[PDB]
Design an enzyme around this catalytic site. Sequence first.
Site, PDB file in Angstrom:
ATOM      1  N   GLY A   1       1.979  -1.651  -9.831  1.00  0.00           N
ATOM      2  CA  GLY A   1       0.810  -2.497  -9.689  1.00  0.00           C
ATOM      3  C   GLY A   1      -0.065  -2.085  -8.518  1.00  0.00           C
TER       4      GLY A   1
ATOM      5  N   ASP B   1       4.078   8.563  -2.479  1.00  0.00           N
ATOM      6  CA  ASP B   1       2.840   8.295  -3.195  1.00  0.00           C
ATOM      7  C   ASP B   1       1.819   9.392  -2.901  1.00  0.00           C
ATOM      8  OD1 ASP B   1       0.009   6.911  -3.459  1.00  0.00           O
ATOM      9  OD2 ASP B   1       1.405   5.644  -4.578  1.00  0.00           O
TER      10      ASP B   1
ATOM     11  N   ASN C   1       2.867 -10.925  -3.351  1.00  0.00           N
ATOM     12  CA  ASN C   1       1.705 -10.426  -2.624  1.00  0.00           C
ATOM     13  C   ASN C   1       0.426 -10.894  -3.303  1.00  0.00           C
ATOM     14  OD1 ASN C   1      -0.088  -8.998  -0.982  1.00  0.00           O
ATOM     15  ND2 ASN C   1       1.248  -7.198  -0.884  1.00  0.00           N
TER      16      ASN C   1
END
Lengths: 97, 228, 262, 268
Positions: free
Chosen positions: D24, D52, D202
């Site tokens: 996400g 990442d 979050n």
Amino acid sequence: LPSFSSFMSRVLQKDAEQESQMRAEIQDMKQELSTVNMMDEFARYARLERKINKMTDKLKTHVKARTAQLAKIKWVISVAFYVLQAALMISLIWKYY
Amino acid sequence: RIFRLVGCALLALGVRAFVCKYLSIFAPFLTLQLAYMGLYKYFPKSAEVINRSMDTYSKMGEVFTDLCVYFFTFIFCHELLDYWAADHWAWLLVLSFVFGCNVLRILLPSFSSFMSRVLQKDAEQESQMRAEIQDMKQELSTVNMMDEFARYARLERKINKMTDKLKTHVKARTAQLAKIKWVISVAFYVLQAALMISLIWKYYVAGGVGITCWILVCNKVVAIVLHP
Amino acid sequence: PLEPTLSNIIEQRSLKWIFVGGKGGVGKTTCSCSLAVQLSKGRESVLIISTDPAHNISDAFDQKFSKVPTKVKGYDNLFAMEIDPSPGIDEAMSYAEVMRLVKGMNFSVVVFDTAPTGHTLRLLNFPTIVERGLGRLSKLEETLPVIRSVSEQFKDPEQTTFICVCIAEFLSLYETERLIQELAKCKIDTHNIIVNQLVFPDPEKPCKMCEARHKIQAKYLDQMEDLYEDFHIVKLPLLPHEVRGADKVNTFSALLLEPYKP
Amino acid sequence: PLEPTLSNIIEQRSLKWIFVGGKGGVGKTTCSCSLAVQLSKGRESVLIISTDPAHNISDAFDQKFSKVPTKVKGYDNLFAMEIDPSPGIDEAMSYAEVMRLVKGMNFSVVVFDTAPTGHTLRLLNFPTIVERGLGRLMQDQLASKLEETLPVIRSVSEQFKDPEQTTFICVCIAEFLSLYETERLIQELAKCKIDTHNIIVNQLVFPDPEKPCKMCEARHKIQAKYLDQMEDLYEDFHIVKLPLLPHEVRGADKVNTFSALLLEPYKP
Ligand SMILES: [Zn+2]
């Protein structure tokens, strides 16, 4: 078998060149992709997966068909083999007669 | 395709009817003229090396059948005359022989079905297992998501668990019985090869190849006709 | 760039099958009934068919229904229906009975509402394959034509079409991408990607989260445009929680003709 | 009931690998940064890693890094790392290289930021397979390389299946699709037998009547429902909620505020 494999590979060198160059660039742009952000470039990224899928699936189905004709060449060499048994058969036939 | 075959069957019948009468010294020539009739007839009805190879195999199979069939025609117009020695019993015995060999190559599925002695005790359990998993999924189907994810996931994990249990059980059984059948198959396989070598020594060149002709060139065709 | 109006889907006769799709917290029932209510005007008679086990058509239309296709209160041509009945043979025969009863009514346009997981017509292709193998070795024969017929009906890129529906979130975007590729693979056609739950704030509201999300969603929407210039786009702003019911459906469906202006 | 804080992780002394995952738009890199900045205080020295491709650490810290650990200004224990190349033998070789260098230099704890597409823990299964093969096949520089990898790979493997020194932190958002994703993820992890005790949420809005905005209560109710069914379905695993932050401050300041909020239980 080894000899025939040598001949088939030596004629199939065109396939062994094209498949090589293609997959080579495929990974080149797969790595490029791996260096592409998933938040600000998703559009181009999506163009890239679509490209990869088209290239891969098309050449891959081509590979199925090629291997089909290859197994047809194994069946004609199996016919050749059955002719070699008929050969050795008539050989013992004449060994008698 | 079937019609040409029954045509050569009526040919065989005619051959039985008159060839042994031996009106003239023409047996092989008439054989190959009858063969030419059909050979030519094929064309009206109907890379380059590939086309030849497929045909060669088809023609060889058919001619081999027809040619020995012509030999059978000398074996029946005269069997009746016998009724009108040891040799005719020797021909008859290989009939029994090959009926036995092929009823056992068809009996192999009977062993597959015979595995059900233990597969029944397997089936009862596995079937009950299925019963629960199916009813659980059917009840799951009647559940929404947005407001019932809790129950959804609860049932999903329960099913998936029993599901993987079942897959493992079934895979183990199948992957066990498979070797069982493989080994019993090779076993009786080398036992019919033993029977062949036994008859070979019982009759310890023309006779051997002839025996092979009667046991294969005909029987395999009969099998492909009755139990394809 | 095209235009943000479903003019094509309304201005076409040869269409008979419309399929709406899309996962996530999307009002699939709302947009289904919306397209249906608008489509009805131009067309003659429209038969809505649900598949979602939530039956939100009942919620939105305040009447009870069943496996029989029936009329609709407060309307003339509107027709509703729903079937949760949507080893491998009895499902195919139930579906065959469904499609037979459909052809009997022979409604000009039968709009669907696919469920949370996938598409119901991918499944239908399985019976034919196994059926041909079974034949190789009664009712199945009869069943065959009523199926090959709708199989052509579907493979035609002119008589049937897909309308996916998405939210402005990266997960749903990637999912809808996968869906569009899977469809184009399975040789269907499509021209429409409705978006949904679109906020539209103004300076009158000093709320700052409403501007943070505003910029995020905007940016995403524009990346969305870039990747789908070929296909049409349908802006569709989020409605207040104030009005729910026929009021809503009417108002919401009004948007699918003129572009939204805040 | 169960503490809404991350006390177990912050207090445990045998932790060596703290994975962080979850697909996400979540700022997992930022959350991991905060976890690291907090962990450093009590502990001795913390070495972040990253996988990442966006290298969010860079924009979060205004510093450049490379394939070698490096100190960051204003911190005496946080060392940055990133690996953009992160046959099979040479893949194992590169992974073994990173493991040996990351672990040898007296590092008590290692924090990962896994990518949003795939999973690299399970990789270890491929080595152990090969190991069985190597003995079975028998019954130069490559043989020596294989010898230096299998014991190391198998040794680093047990700390991971160990539920007292390896810990996973999934992170999701309060929405259906992501919830279902992090569900299937928890299930697949429990299948592959990896410990897990914590689900950070979050992007949490927190409105008040001062704001006559209507969407702020429509989403609010949505968030309520989802967060609560989530609690119900994960009462066991610790739940540590984090509020959404406004866009004014981006940088060390947001890192240290998220750090404070993760240390102490949030209350508006
Ligand atoms: Zn607001």
